[PDB]
Write a protein that binds this ligand. Structure first.
Ligand SMILES: *[C@@H]1O[C@H](CO)[C@@H](O[C@@H]2O[C@H](CO)[C@@H](O[C@@H]3O[C@H](CO[C@H]4O[C@H](CO[C@H]5O[C@H](CO)[C@@H](O)[C@H](O)[C@@H]5O)[C@@H](O)[C@H](O[C@H]5O[C@H](CO)[C@@H](O)[C@H](O)[C@@H]5O[C@H]5O[C@H](CO)[C@@H](O)[C@H](O)[C@@H]5O)[C@@H]4O)[C@@H](O)[C@H](O[C@H]4O[C@H](CO)[C@@H](O)[C@H](O)[C@@H]4O[C@H]4O[C@H](CO)[C@@H](O)[C@H](O)[C@@H]4O)[C@@H]3O)[C@H](O)[C@H]2NC(C)=O)[C@H](O)[C@H]1NC(C)=O
Ligand SMILES: CC(=O)N1CCN(c2ccc3nc(C)n(CC(=O)NCc4ccc(Cl)c(Cl)c4)c(=O)c3c2)CC1
Ligand SMILES: [Ca+2]
Ligand SMILES: [Cl-]
Ligand SMILES: [K+]
Ligand SMILES: [Zn+2]
Length: 805
């Protein structure tokens, strides 16, 4: 109930929301249907429109008018945005030459440059180029300020997950807004774009920027906007807030546009109807910049122009129906569209079988335009699993397609030609970033980055300490003229042991064999040198990784590779090795096929054993440093050490053997040498963070040897490929992956073919950032380089996406 007979007089667009049953006058009272009776009359005036004309100059103030052209209007803060242009001889902001903003140029009383975030729904990255002729204000922000070619959204590439990511720096699995619609099994309630349930704060986690600001004494404008408030009024409202007294005036503001998304869904991303929405957005930007320039704030405020996601061509006829695959389709609930999420129709039904659902949806049609996944098997780069609102079964839908449960859902639940929501590496889903103002760089292009990183930057722009988030603070320092954050490397927590030869062969009873007894002062000093770390500068090019948790581990040196060997997990945490452009691939000799050798540096008690692998009829083993890339027949014996062995399903061995035998050499050919760091990952609770030893759910049968969930590699070279990886003087280039360690290749529909037709496609799908591997391993990489730490932070956030230009 609302006692809506109170009044908005003197309260229009008030900043503090009042509590029931008193009626409201803020910019959300319309959503809530709780505005005072006189809200429209007082606060949503429209008379005479939004523009001054010559005949209104110096008019007598009429309070009925939408905005004002009277002489008192600047002092009151309510002139039309074009007032100075029409009535005072001034130029539109867009018509001025851009001039470097070296320092904030702010009126007296401004304690810090305000931040205005201008968010545009469905603004696809390529609109910057393709729409350039009709967006002059946006094109000026872009060319004069700091811009990226594109900005990567989060998955799913939907509105609410992405805007709330922008506000929090968190993945949707962490903030809780995991879709535009979601069912929470604990609440037993559904959230939707439309309706009242989304008003409840229980859905919204983390700490958004407006709260971070308020907790630290920095006042913040509303970031939500009622849809019925027109854009012109949103802008005049922000400009009026900016005229408040010092002690009342917000430092951060947000404008939101429902365009071009609204039109894009109807007309497709490049429909001829899309030109006008782009023009109207640009006009809005120009109203804002003209307004700022009138208030002498155009060289004082920092503006961010950002989108939430792009837009793809999607029509009713490109719909896959689950009813074509499943017999039991009335037993499921599907969240449909550009992603699929499946759960049982009837909660707590014990017979619903997710495995039978997955099997019925796997590789069933040659052209199939989705792939089903248990959420723990989704590519780790999507960080889309650790929330009870994410259903166990997920369908990743091909771009340009939809999934639906049954045909009636689509012809009675084509009105649309555009949609979004697909995998966040898809080109059509990429969006925009421009930063303009004193604190941003001038005329500067920056590489593409992820929207999770902006919260840290916005905090920096406001002098705030960010709440804990998924950004990497320092990775976007290169956007800013003046940084208030100085990143430093985390401290190493565990120092390694450097064991020498401590055990005789006969002390081991590991059930291993090797044919290695075919045995010189020359090449015995040399091999001792190698075991002591003489080639280490070649194979460990960026320092050893730091271990950032408490554990017991050994550094093991070899001719061809170095490793950090865990005495807790009985396998390396990391194995580092350089392969030059000139390196040769060799086979595993017939006599060494099943060779495994005790490592005399490492106790029997901290070793794996071959018997466990013999007894475990599901589990085999592989090697982290590949015997195929041994520098010499003699060095190759080091690759069969028990300390280089890891547990591998036979199905996974096909992927790993192809990577090691064929792909590493190819990358060394293409990149002029590569440095590879490989290792295991344990993430049995799918939270994206390294498991403790007591979280491990699977061991090699009858042993304490833990089975990894994933295997990683980080593959580094010189960005200037005219220099060899091992003699690089400048910036680096990296690609990485996190492959799921699965006992079948059901993910790869072509897996029955030669690995040359499917393995590399799989690895591309599971591309990763170094930062992702860092979270999953508790390791910190690139500790010793000649590069700045900020530059190395950007390197660690890079993702190789494999999309075309
Ligand atoms: C990306 O970034 C984020 C942010 O850094 C990372 O997410 C963090 O990861 C941490 C480790 O997993 C996790 O720590 C938890 O926190 C538990 C407390 O959780 C509640 O309180 C949080 C703080 O709120 C306040 O924040 C500031 C201070 O920073 C205050 O000033 C304000 O007043 C704030 O209110 C809060 O953020 C958190 O929110 C989640 O839960 C809500 C759902 O109920 C949602 O609204 C919200 O969206 C969050 O939901 C996400 O996170 C939860 C996990 O918290 C997850 O389950 C959801 O799916 C979703 O993902 C809560 O409101 C704390 O109790 C935990 O401590 C237990 O474990 C540790 C481990 O050692 C023990 O030492 C400890 O003693 C304790 O064990 C005991 O209790 C156990 C029961 O859990 C029991 O089993 C055991 O036997 C013991 O009795 C732990 O520290 C952070 O909560 C989490 N933050 C967020 C926002 O998600 C993330 O990892 C990053 N991702 C990657 C890939 O890097
Ligand atoms: C957490 C919190 O404080 N509350 C209280 C406010 N409540 C709320 C109330 C009214 C709303 N009315 C509308 C129209 N809309 C649509 C809208 O504004 N879209 C633009 C937009 C901008 C910024 C963000 Cl971050 C996001 Cl996700 C969306 C909302 O989302 C909305 C939300 C949500 C929970
Ligand atoms: Ca984990
Ligand atoms: Cl959704
Ligand atoms: K076996
Ligand atoms: Zn949309």
């Amino acid at each position: 109930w609302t006692a809506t007979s109170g009044s908005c007089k003197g309260r229009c667009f008030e900043l503090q929301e009042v509590g029931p049953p008193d009626c409201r006058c803020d910019n959300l009272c319309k959503s809530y249907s709780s505005c005072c009776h006189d809200f429209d009359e007082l606060c949503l005036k429209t008379a005479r429109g939004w523009e001054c004309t010559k005949d209104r100059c110096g008019e007598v103030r009429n309070e009925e008018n939408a905005c004002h052209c009277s002489e008192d209007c600047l002092s009151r803060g309510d002139c039309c945005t074009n007032y100075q242009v029409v009535c005072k001889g001034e130029s539109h902001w867009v018509d001025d030459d851009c001039e470097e903003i070296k320092v904030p140029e702010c009126p007296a009383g401004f304690v810090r440059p305000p931040l205005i975030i201008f968010s545009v729904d469905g603004f696809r990255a390529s609109y910057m180029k393709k729409g350039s002729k009709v967006m002059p204000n946006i094109e000026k922000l872009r060319s004069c300020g700091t811009h990226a070619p594109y900005m990567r959204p989060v998955y799913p590439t939907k509105t609410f997950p992405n805007l709330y990511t922008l506000a929090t720096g968190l993945y949707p699995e962490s903030h809780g807004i995991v879709g535009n619609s979601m069912y929470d099994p604990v609440f037993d309630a559904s959230f939707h774009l439309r309706g009242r349930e989304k008003f409840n704060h229980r859905w919204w986690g983390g700490q958004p920027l407006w709260i971070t600001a308020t907790k630290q004494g920095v006042r913040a404008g509303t970031f939500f906007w009622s849809v019925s408030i027109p854009h012109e009024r949103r802008i005049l409202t922000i400009l009026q807030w900016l005229s408040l007294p010092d002690n009342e005036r917000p430092s951060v503001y947000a404008f939101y546009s429902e365009q071009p998304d609204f039109s894009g869904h109807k007309y497709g991303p490049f429909g001829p109807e899309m030109t006008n929405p782009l023009r109207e957005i640009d006009k809005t930007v120009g109203q804002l910049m003209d307004g700022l320039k009138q208030l002498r704030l155009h060289r004082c405020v920092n503006v961010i122009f950002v989108g939430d996601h792009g837009m793809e061509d999607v029509t009713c006829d490109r719909t896959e129906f689950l009813s074509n695959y499943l017999t039991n389709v009335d037993d499921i609930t599907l969240v449909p569209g550009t992603l699929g999420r499946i759960r049982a129709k009837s909660i707590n039904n014990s017979k619903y079988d997710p495995k039978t659902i997955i099997a019925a949806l796997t590789c069933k049609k040659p052209d199939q335009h989705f792939k089903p996944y248990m959420k723990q098997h989704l590519p780790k780069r999507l960080h889309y699993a650790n929330n009870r609102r994410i259903e166990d079964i997920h369908l990743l839908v091909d771009r340009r397609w939809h999934v639906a449960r049954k045909p009636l859902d689509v012809y009675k639940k084509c009105f649309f030609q555009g949609d979004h929501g697909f995998d966040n590496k898809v080109n059509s889903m990429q969006t925009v970033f421009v930063g303009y103002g004193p604190t941003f760089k001038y005329r500067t292009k920056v590489p593409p980055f992820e929207n999770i990183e902006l919260y840290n930057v916005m905090c920096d722009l406001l002098g705030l300490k960010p709440a804990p988030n998924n950004g990497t603070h320092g990775s976007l320092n290169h956007l800013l003229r003046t940084n208030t954050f100085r990143p430093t490397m985390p401290d190493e927590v565990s120092r390694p042991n450097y064991p020498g030869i401590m055990y005789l062969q006969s002390e081991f009873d590991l059930g291993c064999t090797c044919d290695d007894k075919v045995e010189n002062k020359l090449e015995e000093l040399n091999k001792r040198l190698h075991t002591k770390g003489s080639t280490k500068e070649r194979h460990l090019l960026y320092g050893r990784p730091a271990v950032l948790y408490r554990t017991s581990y050994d550094i093991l040196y070899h001719t061809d590779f170095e490793s950090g060997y865990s005495e807790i997990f009985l396998m390396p945490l990391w194995t580092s090795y350089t392969i030059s452009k000139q390196a040769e691939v060799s086979s595993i000799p017939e006599h060494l096929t099943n060779c495994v050798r005790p490592d005399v540096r490492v106790s029997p008690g901290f070793s794996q054993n071959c018997l466990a692998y013999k007894n475990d009829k599901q589990m085999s083993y592989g090697f982290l440093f590949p015997p195929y890339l041994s520098s010499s027949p003699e060095a190759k014996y080091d690759a069969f050490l028990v300390t280089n062995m890891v547990p591998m399903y036979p199905a996974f061995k096909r992927v790993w053997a192809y990577f090691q035998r064929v792909l590493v050499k190819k990358y060394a050919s293409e990149r002029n040498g590569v440095n590879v760091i490989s290792g295991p990952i344990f993430d049995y609770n799918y939270d994206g963070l390294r498991d403790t030893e007591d979280e491990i759910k699977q061991y090699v049968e009858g042993s304490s040897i833990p089975v990894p969930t994933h295997y990683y590699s980080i593959i580094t070279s010189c960005l200037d490929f005219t220099q060899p990886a091992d003699k690089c003087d400048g910036p680096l280039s990296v690609s990485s992956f996190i492959l799921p360690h699965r006992p079948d290749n059901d993910e790869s529909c072509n897996s029955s073919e030669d690995e040359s037709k499917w393995v590399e496609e799989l690895m591309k799908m599971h591309t990763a950032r170094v930062r992702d591997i860092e979270h999953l391993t508790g390791l910190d990489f690139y500790r010793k380089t000649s590069r700045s730490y900020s530059e190395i932070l950007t390197l660690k956030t890079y993702l190789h996406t494999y999309e075309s230009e």
